[PDB]
């Protein structure tokens, strides 16, 4: 039975996303403990994403050098040990935690780049598609589990440190199993010149660049929200006269909204392709516009009620995540197969570069700049963070415009791809 390897890799990916988003739930505790402003809070996630984006292509290339199971297990052990060590960092030191987050990002990039190739090599059928679908559905569930685990451990233990201590141990329990229940596959296949030629061909392409910018905007919005929303909700609750719950609620909402958004995007694409051939970018653009509207609406109605904020977060995150299952189909319809893989790598770089990497530190810097100009108070800091996160709907609308431009150039670039393939 080869399904044991798929199951253990799926559990490992769940734990990977849990470890990635554990810091999100206890960002407030970390800020209170270390006596730092929002700049460091954003910088943690920024460094994590930067290390992830730098290391992912390197590990992807290294996966064809030696056995992938060994390097995958080594990366899992490395990031687990780094997190466990970071759980015991002295208060007066802050750069050590940043370096630990960078090392964890390196390990997570290694795992995320290596494991899907192993899963794809294990199965060659519709079962491969089903297993990849499960492995990728593990993402929102993993993020929700990370949020709720951080909240629950912080509440029960009484100290946030154990939040970084519970996850690594399971990783070891995972890693050994991966060292045992993952079969070894005996598979194999001008590199710089090929990269240069593919980059030159792709730059001249039109819809590909706009789609990459749109997914970069999506990554920007998702990173900023997933990094700052629980803290913003806690500040809003502090503002209200009424006296961990927010993190659990946001984790459950994140999981449910990710699954629902993927489902509704797939359904809208299925039931809208009959109208016209440009359904794939149009659905994404409509979802982005709706998500931007609801992201503005939550900040409009955050001060009034928290139930409305939860509902608006639910709807906005669903609409925002609706594009994840359609971006790949947009990409594979324009780029020719020979240059597809490289294209993905470039996108997997660009979406991280202009998007997820800069978003948390930019939001923190804007919030700090606004807060410095005014006397420090819970109301004023809440307003400053709200104004900082008000930049998200602007980026979401820009991504919607980019999706509209992709729809405009869709048919022309498809025709160019067809005539190049047949040439």
């Amino acid at each position: 039975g080869r399904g044991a390897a798929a199951a253990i890799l799926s559990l490992g990916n769940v734990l990977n996303y849990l470890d990635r988003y554990t810091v999100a739930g206890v960002l407030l505790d970390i800020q209170q403990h270390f006596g730092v402003k929002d700049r460091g809070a954003g910088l943690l996630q920024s460094v994590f994403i930067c290390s992830f984006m730098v290391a992912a292509p390197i590990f992807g290339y290294l996966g064809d050098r030696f056995n992938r199971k060994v390097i995958l297990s080594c990366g899992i052990f490395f990031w687990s040990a780094v997190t466990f060590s970071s759980s015991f960092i002295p208060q007066q030191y802050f750069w050590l935690l940043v370096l630990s987050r960078g090392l964890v990002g390196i390990g997570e990039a290694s795992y995320s780049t290596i494991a899907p190739t192993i899963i794809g090599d294990l199965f060659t059928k519709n079962t491969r598609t089903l297993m990849l679908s499960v492995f990728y559905f593990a993402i929102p569930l993993g993020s929700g589990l990370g949020y709720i685990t951080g909240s629950s451990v912080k509440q029960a233990a009484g100290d946030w440190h154990w939040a970084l201590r519970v996850s690594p141990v399971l990783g070891m329990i995972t890693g050994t199993l991966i060292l045992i229940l993952v079969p070894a596959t005996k598979r194999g296949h001008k590199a710089r010149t090929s990269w240069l030629r593919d980059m030159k061909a792709l730059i001249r392409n039109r819809s590909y660049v706009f789609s990459s910018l749109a997914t970069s905007a999506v990554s920007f919005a998702t990173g900023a929200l997933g990094m700052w929303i629980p803290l913003y909700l806690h500040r809003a609750q502090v503002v209200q006269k009424t006296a961990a719950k927010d993190s659990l609620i946001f984790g459950a909402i994140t999981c449910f909204t990710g699954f629902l958004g993927v489902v509704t995007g797939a359904g809208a694409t299925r039931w809208c392709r009959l109208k016209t051939q440009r359904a794939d970018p149009l659905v994404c653009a409509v979802g982005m516009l709706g998500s931007a509207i609801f992201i503005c609406l939550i900040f409009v109605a955050a001060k009034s009620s928290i139930v409305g904020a939860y509902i608006c977060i639910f709807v906005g995150e669903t609409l925002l995540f609706s594009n994840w299952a359609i971006t790949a189909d947009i990409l594979m319809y324009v780029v020719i197969p020979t240059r597809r893989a490289t294209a993905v790598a470039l996108q997997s770089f660009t979406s991280h570069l202009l998007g997820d990497a800069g978003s948390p530190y930019l939001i923190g810097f804007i919030s700090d700049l606004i807060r410095q100009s005014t006397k420090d108070s819970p109301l004023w800091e809440f307003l400053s963070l709200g104004y900082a996160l008000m930049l998200c709907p602007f980026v979401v609308v820009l991504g919607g415009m980019f999706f509209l431009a992709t729809a405009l150039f869709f048919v022309s670039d498809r025709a160019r791809a067809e005539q190049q393939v047949n040439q």
Partner: nanobody, 126 residues
Framework: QVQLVESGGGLVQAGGSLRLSCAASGRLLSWYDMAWFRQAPGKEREFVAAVTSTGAGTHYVDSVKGRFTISRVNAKNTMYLQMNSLKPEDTAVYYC?????????????????????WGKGTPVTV
């Protein structure tokens, strides 16, 4: 679910010109790469020509280049084929086929089995 209907095929005098129209109404035609095949009386199905989704790619046979033209219109949801200077060996039944669009070499896809969708087929006699 796409239904293909052929029209304009029939017996014609040698050396003339003819137009064949393949119409689809089940779904949108912009999602399908189309092609024409012929069933010779003494042979099996044979590839004739093919048109990609946007019409930017065309492939023919060594005995077909410079004699046949094939194109499509998605606004009217119909593909057309023009045959000129017909040879006596062209008397056969022609089938219009459509397949899910793929960014593969159109010339390499001439296996008469990859096209999951077929039509009624019309006989043309020279």
């Amino acid at each position: 679910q796409v239904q293909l209907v052929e029209s304009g095929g029939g017996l014609v005098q040698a050396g003339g010109s003819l137009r064949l129209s393949c119409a689809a109404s089940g779904r949108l035609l912009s999602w399908y790469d189309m092609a024409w095949f012929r069933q010779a009386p003494g042979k099996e199905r044979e590839f004739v020509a093919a048109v990609t989704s946007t019409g930017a790619g065309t492939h023919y046979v060594d005995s077909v280049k410079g004699r046949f033209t094939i194109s499509r219109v998605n606004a009217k949801n119909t593909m057309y084929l023009q045959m000129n200077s017909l040879k006596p060996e062209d008397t056969a039944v022609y089938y219009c086929a459509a397949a899910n669009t793929r960014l593969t070499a159109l010339s390499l896809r001439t296996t008469t089995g990859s096209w999951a969708y077929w039509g009624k087929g019309t006989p043309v006699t020279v």
